[PDB]
Design a protein around this ligand. Structure first.
Ligand SMILES: [Ca+2]
Ligand SMILES: [Ca+2]
Ligand SMILES: [Ca+2]
Lengths: 159, 558, 143, 876
């Protein structure tokens, strides 16, 4: 009845904004050649401005667990909360990552988020967490639901 | 000389450290040693001293005393046991915010529980005598209102784990042991005719409050012994806080629906009379998913390590016992083709838990078989696998051809294909071991009955047998442990491996045959069938297959 | 009552464990020695066992307290017995005289690398008797 | 156990009891006196007359009741019996009855059972339910007396059993030690008995039971216990009159229950409790033995006083909190503290459960008037002080207090804001519970840390209500509460010099999850940084309008000092939470991640700047009195101590450029300031002491562990010379304690040894003028000279010298000759001190070896050697 987000599926990570008393839907976008840094493109103004979903679509290759990530760092599937995922940018073929090289945007704690070619390292892997209290860790992720990702390398959320 | 002084110093370091370490008891003053002796004497002797008086006390307390001798000129006097149970019931029925701990109830519930059970091949006469004695001893209590009291205490518990709840659960198990129909009927009538929602709410609260394996606490304990800290408690019960409580709580729920009590089985799923309904069937499968997740995480922690330590082995044993009890409880709810519970479990989260158990069984068996020290853990794990397959076979009860439950089950097997493949390879290998050891070529290698075969002779016997591949050869050599003489006892080897394969793989063979017959046109299933041909061919002499007219007025194969 | 050279031998034995030189054995200072001998202690075990010897209660045993624990035990003849105990076990030859050839062989156990020839230069200093092969008597001269 | 050879139970109560019991004191009720001591204690009464009349009246009541007269005394059987039996029970509890009186009054209860080798006792009289309950109470007391007699007999047996066991262990140990050697005795399984803790030794010795029989104790000693245990079992009843109180009670309770349907729930409860006690006599010992303690004869009086104080405190539970009750309980707690048994016997202290009584007395006060603020604040302080001292007494007390950690941290905010209350808050009790116990720190859980993290977040978010009510400026945060919540986290994460990584990872993760706990400066949005925060705090400290409330002095929380202490505590906590060095060498991802997170949170430049901040030196006034800068308000060396700890544990000093830059910017000025305050008058100043403590505990060991980095510093010539001169001046300083002097000696010996030979010429030109004095201060210079002249022997002897270093300039040779001659003369004309002579001889020999035998001194002498500028008078 209800679908479930599984591997090898193309999705867009969309975030909402409440700037100046209105709900604004924004999508995470990045383009391979040129600037590797990720930016946000408006999607609520689709009637006025056509969004560029080409740089917004991402592919979910693996949904391995944290222990599997630890083992492969030492060296077709349904996503479950608390697992490490590998988002691949469809257009560029470069995986999302925490660049760990901040641009010094006021808050010194945060780092920059972009695309990196190499798959090795813990920067590319991201752990999904259930925003909804009804959802639980280990439970399968619904297609329509809220997520809060955590960077393995930096222990920071996509903010 | 100076170098010699340094050389001498190295051993002199040991002397000073040794005398510092020296703490003989005689140096202690008299009072300190006397106090330590009092504590040691207490623990070693007074606590360990045991005497059996529960049956005597209950029999004396249940006797109506001299009623014809002294005339009350009133209502029939209640026996002292009846008065005690009535007091305990009234205390529970009294409205209080919390269930206060009471020593009298704690002691007397234990006494009554011991009285009920009062505990090589027993004959039929002795078995029937024991059943009659158990029935009479349980009647001695449920004729005075213990079945109602054990429900009232659980209701007043308000879903809070405590020794009071543990004693109540033990008493309930004692009175329900063997599937007491009269006690089941009394409990069900009580619950129905006073519409108790607190009982089910407290049951749900307790089942949420039940604990599982904790890698964090176990790793903290590991760091403790690694630093060298002595175990204050030998149990180390920070991991798996209350295994006894969890097992007792689930055994209570299993004995409640034993004997296929369709009425109580349905009433657990849906309390029709009550205003609010709680799904114990779904709560149980939720706890099963929690415990299987904990077990999988513990296995993942022990994946890299070559050998399992004793602490990990005992934690695995306790978790396996808990999971086995939960699986038995789920089986008893889906026994007696109870369609409602079958559908509920089919739509519930049982499938991914079984998938997880399948991976654990596939890898844990491979890991344990090589090492010869923890064969008991392997046996417990395979017993858990047997109970899981029994649960699946009960799930398939009353299934028509091309049934939806069977279809979901084949999807589960397809999802867990590789683990099923490895389990089937394991069983096929250790069942063909018997044909290998019965081959006459091996008897020609070892003509006399001493049975002391050499490693190389066994290796070339396997090649002469030719049925095994090189990978199978290496794996059997690894799983075969021999002394430095390379002298191995194939007799103990086969008695240690084949019979367990024989009596667990039968359930897998039966499940696969059932699925194959009830789905004659499922393409994916013939892959597992052709992978398990050898197991099926071995178990063909032992598999009895008949058809009967089932309770659903339809022909069923048994 | 303690014999004068025994305290002097207790002086050096005290300094053998008092690396810092202040005359106070801290728990960590004592602890590193016990790891060096192979045993792995907990901090509580070390601090528990150090309390019994500490009569003052300062947490660090001084030499006057150290003497009392030394007086607790019978080192009546254990000193030279251990000296002979080493001479017996260092006598791999068993001739009653210990050769210099295995002198380098046991000092390597601690990790020293002093050359083969130079030790028999030092054993010659030990061999004021001139034996050319060290006995217990030379060991007594050494100690 | 048994009065005579035949195993017959003695009459309950009758016997010799030696267990300590509360003292009986009474006061005469006289109203003509003008004294007030009589108000203490209960009024006197004729106890013997009351006892005799009670016995007579009970006898008459029993003899008359059996005939069932129409008119009893008072009109009813209940009125006749209940008050009289209540008075009898009270007298029996007080213990007035003795010997024949007890015999008669027990015969009045049951003639057949208690007759000593017709009329029916009280137990067969068809009594009402209140009378039955009052008789159940009497039977319970008799059973308790039997249990006490059993416990006393067990303690009697233990006296000689333990003595003979100890003698046997001495004999066995002597035989084993004759067999083996002390050095080899550390190993070998035979010595495991003696190396085991005493509790484990007794556990192994008491293996007589069953068939295993692996205990080393012989059969002659085994038989005594294998007889006493069965005697105790027989006395407990584990193996025609009933002849036993146990059987009498067991029959009576069941007979009553089957005779009548009891309506009163209390009677049913009492009867079944008593029946279970009769049928579970082993449980009585199982419960009593853990509460049984043994004391020597000398400690009896002090134990009695401690028990009286405990009784007073326990009895004050039943009365409501108030002025006089607070005074009484505070005085009693002080009495318990002053008692020596409180220290000598902590096991008895815990068995009596005084800590639970203090738990209850604190809970009552804390729960009383939560909205109207915690009334009786001195009481909470005294209770918390008693509890912290209880934790400090013994390790097991910390375990006992760890069980109430959830409540204490839930009430952690009772009195943190109020000053002068340090060590008297529930947070302090929690810190003492989880202080320096590695097992307890490991057992500490995550939600417990989360509670403290939330409290710290609130205190960093909003201001202090009490401070802004007293009139302090309303800054946007509360540093006073934070400096305590951070100290608790420090004690939780850091234990015994090592860092508990499991707790450190949780604390760091929660602190970065909620970043407002870091203070407004380090919050990250428009934050001026740690260095600017310290500068602003210094300025607000000099400003009196913002430092104080400006509407006592100890109550005055200087806002600048509070801010500075908060930031220092946060930095110290983070540095302690930093992963250990060996784990970074191993390369664990978690440790690397934590280290990187801490580096991101705190920059290097901020730490360097805060270290570069200078103090305010004390100065002498015209009159001749030193003016003392205030330490409740100002920049303190303890603040920089945490900065250096963070620098060492997080960033690490591994490069010589950074080492020298830090030495120039922050460390050397402090050394010079100490070397200037080392004057005679300024030495006793709080500044000299605090600065010396900070130096010798943080800076000097850091430079000692970073000693090898000083190898290739040829192009920094003047910096190392200044460092050596300042360190030597600090060593020559007088106010230093022994540990400080040792630290200075070790650091100077390491740095000088690692240093190049040519650089220490300026140190030699001061050492040659000081060493010949050969005073007590000259111990360290002799060793330094020995090590230097041994290491750099080729530099002086060989004409080429060290190939890279070179050779002497002949001025070093002249200085070495003067040193040699001065040392030789001073040793010649000074009195023999063995230590001085054992240290000076190697130095003299090393100098003689270093000096070439063909040495040519030059007709060069030096011009106006600046000896006066280094002489002690004025120090310049
Ligand atoms: Ca001392
Ligand atoms: Ca030799
Ligand atoms: Ca010789």
């Amino acid at each position: 009845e209800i679908q479930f987000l599984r591997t090898d599926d193309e999705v867009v990570l969309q975030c909402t904004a409440t700037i100046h008393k209105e709900q604004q839907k924004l999508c995470l976008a990045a383009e391979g050649f040129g600037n590797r840094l990720c930016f946000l493109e408006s999607t609520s103004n689709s009637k006025n401005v056509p969004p560029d979903l080409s740089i917004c679509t991402f592919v979910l290759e693996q949904s391995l667990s944290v222990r599997a990530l630890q083992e492969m760092l030492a060296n077709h599937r349904t996503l479950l909360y608390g697992h490490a995922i590998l988002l691949r940018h469809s257009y560029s073929g470069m995986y999302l990552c925490c660049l760990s090289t901040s641009r010094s945007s006021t808050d010194k704690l945060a780092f920059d988020v972009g695309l990196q070619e190499d798959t090795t390292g813990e920067a590319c892997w991201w752990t999904i967490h259930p925003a909804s209290k009804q959802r639980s860790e280990g439970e399968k992720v619904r297609v329509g639901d809220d997520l809060i990702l955590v960077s393995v390398s930096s222990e920071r959320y996509l903010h | 000389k100076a170098v010699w002084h340094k050389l001498l110093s190295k051993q002199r370091k040991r002397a000073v450290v040794a005398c510092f370490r020296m703490a003989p008891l005689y140096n202690l003053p008299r009072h300190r040693a006397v106090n330590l002796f009092l504590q040691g004497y207490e623990k070693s002797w007074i606590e360990t001293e045991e005497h059996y008086f529960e049956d005597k006390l209950i029999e004396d307390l249940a006797k109506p005393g001299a009623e014809p001798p002294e005339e009350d000129e009133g209502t029939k006097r209640v026996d002292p046991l009846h008065q005690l149970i009535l007091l305990f019931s009234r205390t529970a029925l009294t409205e209080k915010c919390k269930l206060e701990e009471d020593f009298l109830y704690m002691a007397y519930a234990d006494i009554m529980a011991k009285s009920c059970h009062d505990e090589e091949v027993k004959s039929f006469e002795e078995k029937e005598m024991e059943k009659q004695k158990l029935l009479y001893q349980q009647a001695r209590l449920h004729d005075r209102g213990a079945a109602e009291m054990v429900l009232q205490t659980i209701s007043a518990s308000k879903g809070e784990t405590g020794p009071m709840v543990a004693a109540t659960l033990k008493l309930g198990i004692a009175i329900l042991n063997g599937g007491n129909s009269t006690v089941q009927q009394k409990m069900l009538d009580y619950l129905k005719e006073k519409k108790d929602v607190g009982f089910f709410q407290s049951l749900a609260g307790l089942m949420q409050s039940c604990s599982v394996l904790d890698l964090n606490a176990f790793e903290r304990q590991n760091k403790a012994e690694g630093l060298g800290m002595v175990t204050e408690e030998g149990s180390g019960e920070k991991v798996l806080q209350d295994d006894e409580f969890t097992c007792d709580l689930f055994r209570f729920l299993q004995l409640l629906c034993e004997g296929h009590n369709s009425d109580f089985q349905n009433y657990l799923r849906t309390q029709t009379g009550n205003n609010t309904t709680v799904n114990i069937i779904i709560s149980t499968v939720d706890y099963l998913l929690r415990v299987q997740e904990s077990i999988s995480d513990f296995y993942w922690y022990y994946s890299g390590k070559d050998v399992i330590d004793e602490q990990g082995q005992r934690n695995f044993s306790k978790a396996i016992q808990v999971a086995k009890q939960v699986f038995n409880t789920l089986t008893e709810y889906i026994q007696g083709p109870c369609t409602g519970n079958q559908q509920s479990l089919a739509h519930s989260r049982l499938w991914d838990a079984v998938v997880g158990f399948l991976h654990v069984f596939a890898h844990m068996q491979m890991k344990l078989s090589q090492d010869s020290s923890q064969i008991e853990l392997l046996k417990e794990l395979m017993d858990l696998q047997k109970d899981m397959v029994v649960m699946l076979l009960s799930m398939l009860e009353g299934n028509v051809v091309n049934g939806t439950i069977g279809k979901q089950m084949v999807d589960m097997l397809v999802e867990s294909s590789n683990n099923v493949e490895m389990i089937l390879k394991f069983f096929d290998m250790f069942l063909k071991l018997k044909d290998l050891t019965s081959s006459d070529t091996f008897k020609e290698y070892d003509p006399d009955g001493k049975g002391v075969i050499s490693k190389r002779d066994f290796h070339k016997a396997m090649e002469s047998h030719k049925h095994y591949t090189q990978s199978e050869t290496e794996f059997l050599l690894s799983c075969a442990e021999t002394d430095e003489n390379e002298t191995l006892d194939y007799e103990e080897f086969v008695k240690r491996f084949h019979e367990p394969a024989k009596d667990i793989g039968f359930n897998v063979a039966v499940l696969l045959t059932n699925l194959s017959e009830h789905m004659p046109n499922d393409t994916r299933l013939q892959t597992f069938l052709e992978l398990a041909e050898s197991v099926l061919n071995y178990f063909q002499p032992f598999l009895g297959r008949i058809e009967i007219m089932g309770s659903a007025k339809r022909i069923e194969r048994v | 009552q303690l014999t004068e050279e025994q305290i002097a031998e207790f002086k050096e034995a005290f300094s053998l464990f008092d690396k810092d030189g202040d005359g106070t054995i801290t728990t960590k200072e004592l602890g590193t020695v016990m790891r060096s001998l192979g045993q792995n202690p907990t901090e509580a075990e070390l601090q528990d066992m150090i309390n019994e010897v500490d009569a003052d209660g300062n947490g660090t045993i001084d030499f006057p307290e150290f003497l009392t624990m030394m007086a607790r035990k019978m080192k009546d003849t254990d000193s030279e017995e251990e000296i002979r105990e080493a001479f017996r076990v260092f006598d791999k030859d068993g001739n009653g005289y210990i050769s210099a050839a295995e002198l380098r062989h046991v000092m390597t156990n601690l990790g020293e690398k002093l050359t083969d020839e130079e030790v028999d230069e030092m054993i010659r200093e030990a061999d004021i008797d001139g034996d050319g092969q060290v006995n217990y008597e030379e060991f007594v001269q050494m100690m | 156990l048994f009065p005579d050879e035949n195993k017959k139970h003695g009459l309950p109560g009758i016997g010799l009891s030696t267990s300590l019991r509360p003292r009986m004191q009474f006061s005469s009720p006289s109203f003509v006196s003008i004294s007030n001591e009589c108000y203490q204690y209960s009024p006197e009464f004729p106890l013997d007359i009351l006892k005799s009349k009670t016995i007579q009246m009970l006898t008459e009541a029993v003899k008359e009741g059996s005939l069932h007269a129409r008119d009893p005394v008072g009109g009813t059987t209940e009125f006749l019996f209940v008050p009289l039996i209540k008075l009898f029970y009270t007298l029996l509890i007080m213990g007035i009855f003795h010997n024949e009186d007890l015999k008669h009054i027990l015969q009045l209860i049951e003639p057949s059972v208690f007759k000593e080798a017709p009329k029916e006792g009280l137990l067969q009289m068809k009594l009402p339910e209140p009378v039955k309950l009052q008789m159940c109470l009497l039977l319970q007391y008799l059973c308790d007396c039997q249990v006490r007699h059993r416990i006393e007999a067990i303690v009697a047996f233990s006296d000689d059993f333990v003595a003979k066991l100890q003698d046997n262990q001495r004999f066995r140990y002597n035989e084993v030690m004759q067999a083996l050697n002390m050095s080899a005795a550390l190993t070998a399984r035979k010595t495991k008995e003696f190396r085991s803790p005493p509790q484990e030794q007794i556990n192994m010795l008491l293996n007589f039971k069953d068939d295993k029989s692996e205990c080393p104790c012989p059969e002659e000693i085994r038989d005594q216990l294998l007889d006493f245990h069965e005697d105790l079992m027989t006395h407990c009843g584990i193996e025609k009159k009933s002849s036993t109180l146990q059987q009498l009670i067991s029959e009576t309770m069941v007979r009553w229950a089957q005779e009548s349907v009891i309506e009163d729930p209390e009677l049913v409860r009492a009867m079944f409790v008593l029946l279970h006690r009769q049928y579970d006599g082993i449980g009585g010992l199982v419960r009593a033995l853990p509460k049984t303690y043994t004391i020597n004869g000398v400690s009896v009086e002090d134990t009695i006083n401690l028990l009286a104080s405990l009784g007073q405190i326990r009895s004050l539970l039943s009365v409501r909190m108030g002025k006089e009750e607070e005074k009484l309980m505070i005085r009693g707690l002080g009495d318990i503290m002053n008692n020596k048994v409180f220290y000598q016997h902590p096991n008895l202290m815990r068995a009596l459960g005084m800590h639970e009584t203090v738990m209850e007395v604190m809970v009552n006060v804390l729960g009383g008037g939560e909205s109207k603020e915690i009334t009786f604040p001195k009481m909470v302080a005294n209770c918390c002080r008693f509890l912290c001292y209880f934790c400090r007494i013994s390790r097991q007390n910390q375990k006992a207090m760890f069980d109430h950690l959830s409540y204490l941290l839930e009430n952690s905010s009772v009195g943190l804001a109020s000053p002068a209350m340090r060590g008297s808050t529930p947070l302090d009790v929690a810190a003492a519970s989880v202080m320096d116990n590695n097992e307890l720190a490991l057992a500490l859980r995550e939600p417990d840390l989360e509670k403290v993290v939330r409290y710290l977040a609130g205190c960093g978010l909003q201001s202090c209500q009490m401070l802004v009510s007293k009139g302090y400026p309303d800054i946007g945060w509360n540093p006073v509460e934070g400096e305590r919540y951070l100290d608790f986290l420090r004690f939780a994460v850091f234990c015994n010099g090592e860092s508990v990584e499991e707790n450190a990872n949780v604390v760091v993760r929660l602190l970065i999850r909620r970043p407002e706990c870091f203070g407004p400066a380090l919050r990250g949005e428009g934050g001026n940084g740690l260095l600017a925060a310290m500068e602003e705090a210094i300025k607000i400290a000099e400003d009196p309008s913002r430092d104080g409330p400006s509407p006592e002095e100890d109550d005055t929380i200087h806002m600048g000092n509070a801010i500075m202490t908060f930031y220092s505590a946060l930095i110290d906590l983070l540095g302690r939470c930093a992963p250990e060095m060996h784990l970074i060498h191993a390369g664990k991802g978690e440790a690397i991640r934590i280290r990187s997170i801490l580096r991101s949170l705190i920059p290097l430049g901020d730490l360097v700047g805060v270290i570069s901040i200078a103090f305010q030196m004390p100065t002498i006034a015209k009159d001749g009195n030193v003016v003392e800068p205030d330490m409740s308000a100002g920049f303190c060396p303890d603040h920089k101590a945490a900065m250096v700890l963070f620098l060492d544990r997080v960033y690490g000093i591994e490069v010589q450029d950074f080492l020298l830059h830090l030495l120039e910017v922050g460390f050397l000025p402090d050394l010079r300031a100490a070397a200037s305050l080392d004057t005679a008058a300024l030495s006793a100043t709080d500044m000299a002491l605090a600065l010396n403590r900070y130096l010798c505990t943080a800076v000097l060991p850091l430079l000692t562990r970073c000693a090898p980095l000083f190898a290739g510093t040829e192009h920094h010539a003047s910096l190392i010379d200044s460092l050596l001169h300042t360190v030597y001046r600090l060593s020559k300083g007088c106010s230093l304690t022994k540990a400080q002097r040792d630290s200075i000696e070790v650091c100077l010996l390491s740095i000088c040894g690692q240093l190049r030979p040519s650089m220490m010429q300026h140190l030699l030109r001061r050492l040659v003028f000081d060493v010949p004095l050969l005073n007590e201060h000259a111990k360290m210079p002799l060793k330094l000279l020995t090590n230097h002249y041994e290491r750099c022997w080729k530099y002086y002897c060989l004409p080429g010298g060290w190939g890279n270093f070179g050779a002497a300039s002949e001025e070093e040779l002249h200085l070495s000759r003067k040193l040699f001659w001065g040392i030789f003369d001073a040793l010649s004309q000074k009195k023999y001190e063995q230590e001085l002579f054992k240290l000076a001889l190697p130095c003299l020999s090393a100098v003689a070896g270093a000096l070439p035998p063909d040495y040519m001194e030059s007709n060069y002498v030096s011009m106006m050697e600046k000896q006066s500028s280094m002489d002690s008078e004025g120090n310049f």
